[PDB]
Design a protein around this ligand. Structure first.
Ligand SMILES: CCCCOC(=O)N1CCN(C(=O)[C@H](CP(=O)(O)O)NC(=O)c2cc(N3CC[C@H](OC)C3)nc(-c3ccccc3)n2)CC1
Ligand SMILES: CC(C)CCC[C@@H](C)[C@H]1CC[C@H]2[C@@H]3CC=C4C[C@@H](O)CC[C@]4(C)[C@H]3CC[C@]12C
Length: 363
């Protein structure tokens, strides 16, 4: 009824999948060799470990899709392996949500290794006995069971998608907050030093009065942003603000030359000592690695987001062959992106697991 370019149907796609199959077998190959030469000492390494599996279960369905699509009984093994694939994909999606959570929790931190394995087994089993009826199969109980599983699967995606949205939203708000705090504090000090130069090269009392005002404000801002350390990180600020206040008085009284020299006293060795110490106390770096953590949301968005997003228009809202062909391609390519996950998961192991990257540095 409807015809498409076999250059794309029987060639491009089978090759695209062939790429994925190899690229995916090698990376997940040496991955599994690394992962069972690492003791499972946390939630994370454990969820990662399950990912290696569901990835190899994914790769091992590619050939049957490759040979079928390139036109090489022959049709029932297609229904089974595709079930195994769909099983595989929603497992990947489930663990990715857990990995998200697990990673999000370690970014709100300066009983497990046993419940983690159990939750894993729940994941698999609940997918398996949801994948069983589809490959168990006239009897029209099953083609309404398709609307059952298809429904479950939408919920599985959307819940884990929400998880991802929330966790990365909380991680983004925190990393932003952390950035602005440090950016401002650096600003504070930079203003202090900048308005001293202004003072140094100033004529009137108005120039001195203004720069000192900015300095006073910046200093007090710095002090606010720098609570004392639990171990003279409060008395120091009193000295610096003191000098600034003194210089301000001199500048208000009219004596600009004295003002400038009172200002200059921040350049004494002791005052600069104090400054360097107060600058020191201020910087306390402890933020989650940027392009390292976001890899997950990335992989999730590349692989799983499109297949589900693209469905909602033309699942919730035609005879012509271009529209039915547009749909074929959209579905088929999004499903390719889905499969790409088995190749993008090794990246998560690399960019986020210390021990993994070590074996990978070696073997
Ligand atoms: C726990 C795991 C258990 C194992 O899982 C399974 O066994 N699953 C059964 C198959 N299932 C699907 O998700 C099926 C795949 P298939 O149809 O069987 O190949 N997709 C659809 O049923 C479907 C329908 C649809 N429409 C409904 C009419 C409308 O006509 C206008 C089109 N559109 C799209 C769509 C997709 C991507 C992009 C654009 C559109 N998909 C996944 C879960
Ligand atoms: C389908 C409708 C009713 C919305 C339901 C969404 C549920 C399933 C999602 C949305 C936001 C999610 C939460 C987002 C963040 C956290 C904090 C983390 O420390 C543990 C998981 C937890 C608590 C998630 C659990 C699942 C959650 C509550």
């Amino acid at each position: 009824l409807c015809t498409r370019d076999y250059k794309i149907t029987q060639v491009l796609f089978p090759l695209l999948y062939t790429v994925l199959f190899f690229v995916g077998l090698i990376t997940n190959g040496l991955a599994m060799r690394i992962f069972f030469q690492i003791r499972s000492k946390s939630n994370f390494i454990i969820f990662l470990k399950n990912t290696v599996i569901s990835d190899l279960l994914m790769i091992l369905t590619f050939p049957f899709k490759i040979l079928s699509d390139a036109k090489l009984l022959r049709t029932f093994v297609c229904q089974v392996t595709s079930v195994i694939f769909y099983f595989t994909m929603y497992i990947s999606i489930s663990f990715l949500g857990l990995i998200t959570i697990d990673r999000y929790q370690k970014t709100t931190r300066p009983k497990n290794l046993l419940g983690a394995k159990i939750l894993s087994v729940v994941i698999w089993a609940f997918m398996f006995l949801l994948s069983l009826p589809n490959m168990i199969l006239k009897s029209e109980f099953g083609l309404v069971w398709h609307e059952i599983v298809n429904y479950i699967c939408q919920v599985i995606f959307w819940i884990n998608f929400l998880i991802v949205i929330v966790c990365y939203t909380l991680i983004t708000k925190e990393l932003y907050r952390s950035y602005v705090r440090t950016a401002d504090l650096e600003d504070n000090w930079e203003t202090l030093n900048d308005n001293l130069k202004v003072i140094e090269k100033a004529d009137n009392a108005a120039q001195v009065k203004d720069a000192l005002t900015k300095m006073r404000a910046a200093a007090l801002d710095a002090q606010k942003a720098t609570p004392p350390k639990l171990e003279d990180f409060r008395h120091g600020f009193d000295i610096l603000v003191g000098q600034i206040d003194d210089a301000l008085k001199l500048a208000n009284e009219g004596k600009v030359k004295e003002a400038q020299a009172a200002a200059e006293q921040l350049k004494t060795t002791r005052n600069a000592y104090i400054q360097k110490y107060l600058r020191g106390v201020g910087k306390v770096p402890r933020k989650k690695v940027n392009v390292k953590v976001f890899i997950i949301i990335a992989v999730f968005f590349i692989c799983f987001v499109p297949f589900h997003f693209a469905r909602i228009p033309y699942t919730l809202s035609v005879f012509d062959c271009t529209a039915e062909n547009t749909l074929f391609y959209v579905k088929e390519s999004t499903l390719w992106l889905t499969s790409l996950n088995a190749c993008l998961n090794p990246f998560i192991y690399f960019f986020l697991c210390k021990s993994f990257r070590n074996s990978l540095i070696s073997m």
